[PDB]
Amino acid sequence: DRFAVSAEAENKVREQQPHVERIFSVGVSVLPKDCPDNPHIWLQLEGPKENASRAKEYLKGLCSPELQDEIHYPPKLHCIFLGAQGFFLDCLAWSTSAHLVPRAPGSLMISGLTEAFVMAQSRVEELAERLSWDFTCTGVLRDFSALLQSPGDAHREALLQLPLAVQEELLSLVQEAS
């Protein structure tokens, strides 16, 4: 299956191409235009149909976002979006097809089609809510420790010091993405 986007947004497609490949594990191909004055370009996505559907929605949303806005949360939750070299952000982008850009600590720019923005907002809200489910280092799930073994990671500490409820949701997100 193929689909079209604005020719004026080809620049965007190419900037994001590697991230799209990494996140959805797909190939992005742009077809040559049949005429120069064409307002659209056709894309073809290479990979499993699941991966491709999600990439499609990401790319549509990237090229002309139906929603673009900052979500706001406790600054101490910001490590989740920067830690493990962006692994969690990637898993969240996978699960929602939203384009996600960390801003100030406690601020995340979410962007894409509307159903993608709301589902990402929702998931980010849930994480934030679960920070309040602290009932106090202070405890770590084995499987969570397991993902964060990459020693250089500068947000490794902050992540480990997250309460177990946030850790469990992050596991659930990673599990969803694999």
Residue 12, C-beta contacts closer than 8 angstroms, at least 6 positions apart: 62, 63
Using the Cα atoms of residue 65, residue 69, residue 70 and residue 71 in order, give the sign of their dihedral. negative
CB 99 within 8 A of CB 61: yes
Q: Do domains 2-63 and 67-177 have the same CATH topology?
A: yes
Pair type for strands 99-102 and 107-112:
antiparallel
Q: Would you give the DSSP letter of residue 83? A: S
Residue 122, C-beta contacts closer than 8 angstroms, at least 6 positions apart: none
Residue 37, C-beta contacts closer than 8 angstroms, at least 6 positions apart: none
CA distance 53 to 32: 22
Coil vs helix vs strand at 156: helix
CA 37 to mean position of chain CA atoms = 34
CA distance 47 to 173: 22
Q: Which fold has domain 67-177?
A: Ribosomal Protein S8; Chain: A, domain 1 (3.30.1370)
Residue 80, C-beta contacts closer than 8 angstroms, at least 6 positions apart: 88, 89, 127, 159, 162, 166, 170
Residue 25 one-letter amino acid: S
Q: Resolution of the experimental model in angstroms, please?
A: 2.2
77-109 as b/e: b if 16+ CB within 10 A? bbbbbbbbebbbbbbbbbbbbbbbebeeebebe
- How many C-beta atoms lie closer than 10 Å to residue 4's C-beta? 14
Give the Å distances, CA to CA, from 161 to 48, 92, 101, 177, 178.
Answer: 37, 21, 23, 23, 24
CA distance 21 to 159: 26
Give residue limits of the domains in the chain. Answer: 2-63, 67-177
Residues across the chain: 178
* Helix and strand element counts for the chain (H, E): 8, 6
- CATH no., domain 2-63: 3.30.1370
Nearest-5° angle of CA 138, CA 140, CA 145? Answer: 140
CB 43 within 8 A of CB 59: yes
